[PDB]
Design a protein around this ligand. Structure first.
Ligand code: GCP
Ligand code: CL
Ligand code: MG
Length: 726
């Protein structure tokens, strides 16, 4: 019965000791979703298709012909270990690089990770990505080597060849961890003997581990015989997949009691000795509320659902919380937990749990909900990759113009790695995302779920603007000519750029804490001390001496900074990589003369003129491309990538197969999937990995800038410094 399950989960909810919050991560197609569905079945939970909310849902044959996971799915299992019941919360995540946003949002909510590796392919590009994403969040990883059934029969190899090849995978994962966090590699290391690694077949519901093997007697000899004599069904009775893997989850992944104090080191810049600081570290149900929202979605009946991680306190219907950056308190309607594949309403929820909540009218992804309005909010959920592809979207019928604006707004709310620009003048809206497939899925769902016929344009790349040298001081001047600002500008140093990109500094930190981090990474003491604003991948530094009225005028200066960052002076593309320094300023004494109408245009104009004096340039995004190919088709694949402005970084040969490691610009990778096939008689297997932005060749700057200004309908003239400081 489901009668019994509800009481079991509700009981365990109040016992943080017996909770595991975990995510399943892997390179695409390595077996994440087969593993999640079959752990859920072995535990005795009902399957997703029989869920109450799914009764009236047809199986769209197009979205499931690819079978690819597109969105994260939350489930929970009750599992019995050494005579005690544990609540395991699980998040199954997408593999495809275009949906890496869902992976970062999931890592924010869990405390442990099962990394799945294909025994045939071994470790692949996104195996590195997901491992890095977990360690950045202080999540503990363990290893499950999958598809071992395919390794045995397709390769017809020795038992000793099987020990070697599987140890080869374990070694590769250990090297990645050592490189990524050398200080604590001794603690995170995966040892096979203790039980931190498991092997099996998710598809066929068996798995083995060393503590289980000696506690059972089965050897590698018996495992090979089972698979070659067509008896994998009997190997699953002796070594059940959920038994081995759920025991390992309970034995080596942390409960909220051991892990919440380590998560808060990287996700919160508040006082760790404060009331909320230690009550989060205590998983204290009687503390103030601290709710970390990681997902927004919509329910046909209940409305909007906010999902995330409760770190301190209790929630129930009618309790009021503030949303970070919003003035009015929101009131809770329903609180719920995931039990199997369903979301069920409970009377109360407590710290330590993954929770779902309705009524928070102002919630968004990354929000903090708290009892006290003044709590320092949790760090943002940063995806380490910016949007690089854009299409224009228009409603097919003009009678649908408002509904499409509504539909597009909810869509960007639910997936924040999308950027939506709405233009109710032209009726044409830009939609920017991580790749062509990302945009394809968005368009297909607006037309299928929201019932709004749309037309989309051909995809185009999204550039960035930056500077290449130092310039200044440059003077910006308010329209009434009373206020003046003196600005220098130059590129961020790469070490400082990484601190900003990784969220290791913020203006929420204590001053001495932030300054020591900056100085340890190169910055002079005076610049570390004067930093006042961090936006995107740029910083603003106040170097002034002590100017009356500057402090209350600074927010207006920073709004001018932000307007330039949203679209730069070459082509109105987003800006990255700047260190902007305020060296001096003249201000009028009367507030009526130094308001928004005067300060924002002067700040805006000094920054834009300094940029054009500092060698402004465009950057275009580049991908790293891995091409697996048989010897015969090597030359074909080589020509095809070098004909798309591709450069070869390395080449590796294992027997008959060569792996080509190249880099190429996004702008030239449209149509690659079908061109790489027609060029390698269909044998090429490839994957990508975002590399970075690189400057466009100085001979291509003016052509590229003018083409963007054309497409955007701006004046077809190169900007000069005299256009701003006038
Ligand atoms: N032979 C074999 N095939 C398996 C095993 N586990 C999964 N597969 C197969 O691999 C393919 C992908 O499995 P799936 O669970 O969807 O992997 P995924 O990592 O979730 C795919 P995505 O990254 O898109 O979310 C399927 O065809 C599935 O049947 C296994 O243990 N053995
Ligand atoms: Cl710097
Ligand atoms: Mg999947």
């Amino acid at each position: 019965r489901r009668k019994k399950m509800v009481e079991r989960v509700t009981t365990l909810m109040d016992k943080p000791e017996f909770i595991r919050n975990i995510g399943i991560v892997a390179h695409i197609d390595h077996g994440k979703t087969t593993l999640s569905d079959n752990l859920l079945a072995g535990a005795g939970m009902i399957s997703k298709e029989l869920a109450g909310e799914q009764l009236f849902m047809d199986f769209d044959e197009e979205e499931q012909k690819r079978g690819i996971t597109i969105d994260s799915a939350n489930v929970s299992m009750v599992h019995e270990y050494e005579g005690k019941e544990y609540l395991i919360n699980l998040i199954d995540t997408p593999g495809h690089v275009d949906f890496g946003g869902d992976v970062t949002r999931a890592m924010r909510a869990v405390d442990g990770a099962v990394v799945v590796v294909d025994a045939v392919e071994g470790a692949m590009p996104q195996t590195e990505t997901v491992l890095r994403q977990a360690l950045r969040e202080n999540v503990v990883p363990i290893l499950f080597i999958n598809k071992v059934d395919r390794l045995i029969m397709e390769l017809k190899l020795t038992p000793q060849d099987m020990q070697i090849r599987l140890g080869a995978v374990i070694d590769k994962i250990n090297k990645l961890i050592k490189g990524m966090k050398p200080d604590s590699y001794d603690g995170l290391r995966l040892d096979a003997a203790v039980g931190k690694v498991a092997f099996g077949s998710a598809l066929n519901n068996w798995a083995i581990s060393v503590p289980f093997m000696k506690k059972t007697g089965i050897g590698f000899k018996e495992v090979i015989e089972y698979c070659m004599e067509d008896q994998q069904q009997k190997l699953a009775e002796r070594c059940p997949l959920h038994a081995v893997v759920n025991d390992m989850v309970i034995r080596f992944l942390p409960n909220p009691v051991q892990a919440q104090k380590e998560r808060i080191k990287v996700i919160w810049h508040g006082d760790k000795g404060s009331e909320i600081g230690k009550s989060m570290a205590n998983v204290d149900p009687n503390g103030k509320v601290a709710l970390m929202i990681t997902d927004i979605s919509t329910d046909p009946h209940a409305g909007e659902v906010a999902t995330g991680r409760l770190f301190s306190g209790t929630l129930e219907r009618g309790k009021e919380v503030y949303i970070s950056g919003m003035p009015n308190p929101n009131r809770i309607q329903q609180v719920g937990l995931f039990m199997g594949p369903e979301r069920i309403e409970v009377d109360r929820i407590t710290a330590g749990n993954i929770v779902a909540v309705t009524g928070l009218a102002d919630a968004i992804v990354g929000s903090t909900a708290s009892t006290d309005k003044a709590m320092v909010p949790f760090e943002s959920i940063r995806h380490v990759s910016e949007p690089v592809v854009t299409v224009a979207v228009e409603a097919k019928h003009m009678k649908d113009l408002p509904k499409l604006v509504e539909v597009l707004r909810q869509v960007a709310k639910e997936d924040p790695t999308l950027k939506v620009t709405i233009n109710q003048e032209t009726g044409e809206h830009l939609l920017a995302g991580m790749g062509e497939l990302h945009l394809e899925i968005v368009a297909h769902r607006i037309q299928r779920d929201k019932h709004v016929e749309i037309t989309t344009s051909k995809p185009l790349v999204v550039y960035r603007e930056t500077v290449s040298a130092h310039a200044g001081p440059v003077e910006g001047k308010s329209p009434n000519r009373h206020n003046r600002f003196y600005i220098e500008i130059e590129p961020l140093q790469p070490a400082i750029f990484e601190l900003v990109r990784n969220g290791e500094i913020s203006m929420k930190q204590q001053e001495v804490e932030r300054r020591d981090i900056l100085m340890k990474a190169g910055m002079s003491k005076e610049e570390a001390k004067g930093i006042t604003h961090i936006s995107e991948n740029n910083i603003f530094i106040d170097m002034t001496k002590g100017i009356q009225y500057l402090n209350e005028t600074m927010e207006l200066v920073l709004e001018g900074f932000e307007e330039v960052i949203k679209g730069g002076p070459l082509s109105r593309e987003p800006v990255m990589g700047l260190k902007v320094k305020l060296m001096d300023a003249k201000l009028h004494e009367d507030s009526i003369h130094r308001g928004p109408a005067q300060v924002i245009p002067a700040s805006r104009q000094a920054i834009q003129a300094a940029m054009l004096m500092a060698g402004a340039t465009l950057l275009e995004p580049f991908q790293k491309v891995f091409i697996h190919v048989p010897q015969e088709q090597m030359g074909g694949a080589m020509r095809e990538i070098q004909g798309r402005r591709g450069a070869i970084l390395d080449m590796k040969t294992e027997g008959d197969t060569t792996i080509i490691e190249a880099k190429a610009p996004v702008a030239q990778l449209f149509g690659f999937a079908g061109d790489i096939r027609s060029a390698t008689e269909g044998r090429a297997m490839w994957s990508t990995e975002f590399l970075g932005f690189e400057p466009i060749p100085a001979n291509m700057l003016a052509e590229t800038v003018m083409g963007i200004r054309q497409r955007k309908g701006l004046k077809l003239e190169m900007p000069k410094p005299s256009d701003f400081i006038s």
